Design a protein around this ligand. Structure first.
Ligand SMILES: C=Nc1ncc(F)c(-c2cccnc2Oc2ccc(NC(=O)c3ccccc3Nc3ccccc3)cc2)n1
Length: 246
């Protein structure tokens, strides 16, 4: 409960980014094996996100799920800040997606279920999410997927703030599923302008090898109007999902 850097025996550099570096680590006390991010407050300031982090570490800490990367604890010295995190032994879905180019109908559906499961929990524990990427998806030991993200003159459209923020994740789920099945995201193009074009006008096209159940689901998630995309529950109960999830 009262953490210091010499409570930890340090292993191999696990990669860097963005403010800090991650190392492999072990609790001298419980010999428990975990990752450790090392953020520098100097690097947080020249990016103005010190309070933003502390804010989110308090949110993160109260999220226990097999499909969400577990944060165990945190601490600091004057120069450095440390985050004690679940080591995902099997690499990212990015690296793996490059190794396999695309995934099988079942590998994709299982991954969607897990995401959906995790996202539902967040929605339930009152914490909505923005965008999910393959690069932000880590892999546990048993192939399991881990989200590792980080007046009186005022009108109605300014006091109701952000109306539909819950529904972004369903778009993300649509996009992801596609990339998993195809190897590329659905509005990927050459110019940034042509990508912007296809995202705005919702312009994606399934190559022939894609199944119907997938085309059906993906289309339902990728609706222009946010309030038309299925609620997470429905994704878990989709013919295609309920036929490949395990
Ligand atoms: C190879 N497996 C593996 N396992 C665990 C790992 F952490 C990593 C890893 C290695 C190198 C770089 N990144 C890695 O993954 C992550 C992914 C997410 C995080 N999460 C955070 O850094 C974070 C968690 C809770 C709260 C805040 C966090 N960061 C944050 C920083 C600034 C502002 C806001 C949030 C940490 C490491 N890699």
């Amino acid at each position: 409960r009262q953490w210091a850097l010499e409570d930890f025996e340090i292993g191999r550099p696990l990669g860097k980014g963005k403010f800090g570096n991650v190392y492999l680590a072990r609790e001298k006390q419980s010999k428990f094996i975990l990752a450790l991010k090392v953020l520098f407050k100097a690097q947080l300031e020249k990016a103005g996100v010190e309070h933003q982090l502390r804010r989110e570490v308090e949110i993160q800490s109260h999220l226990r799920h097999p499909n969400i990367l577990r944060l165990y604890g945190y601490f600091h010295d004057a120069t450095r800040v440390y985050l004690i995190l679940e080591y995902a032994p099997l690499g990212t879905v990015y690296r793996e997606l490059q190794k396999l180019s695309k995934f099988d109908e079942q590998r994709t559906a299982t991954y969607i279920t897990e995401l959906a499961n995790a996202l539902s929990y967040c929605h339930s524990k009152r914490v909505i999410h923005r965008d999910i990427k393959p690069e932000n998806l880590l892999l546990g030991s048993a192939g399991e997927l881990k989200i590792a993200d980080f007046l009186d003159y005022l009108p109605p459209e300014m006091i109701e703030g952000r109306m539909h923020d819950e529904k972004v994740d369903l778009w993300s789920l649509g996009v992801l599923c596609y990339e998993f099945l195809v190897g590329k995201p659905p509005f990927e193009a050459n110019t940034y302008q042509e990508t912007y074009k296809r995202i705005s006008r919702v312009e994606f096209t399934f190559p022939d090898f894609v199944t119907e159940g997938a085309r059906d689901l993906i289309s339902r998630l990728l609706k222009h109007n946010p309030s038309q995309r299925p609620m997470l529950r429905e994704v878990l109960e989709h013919p295609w999902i309920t036929a490949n999830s395990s």
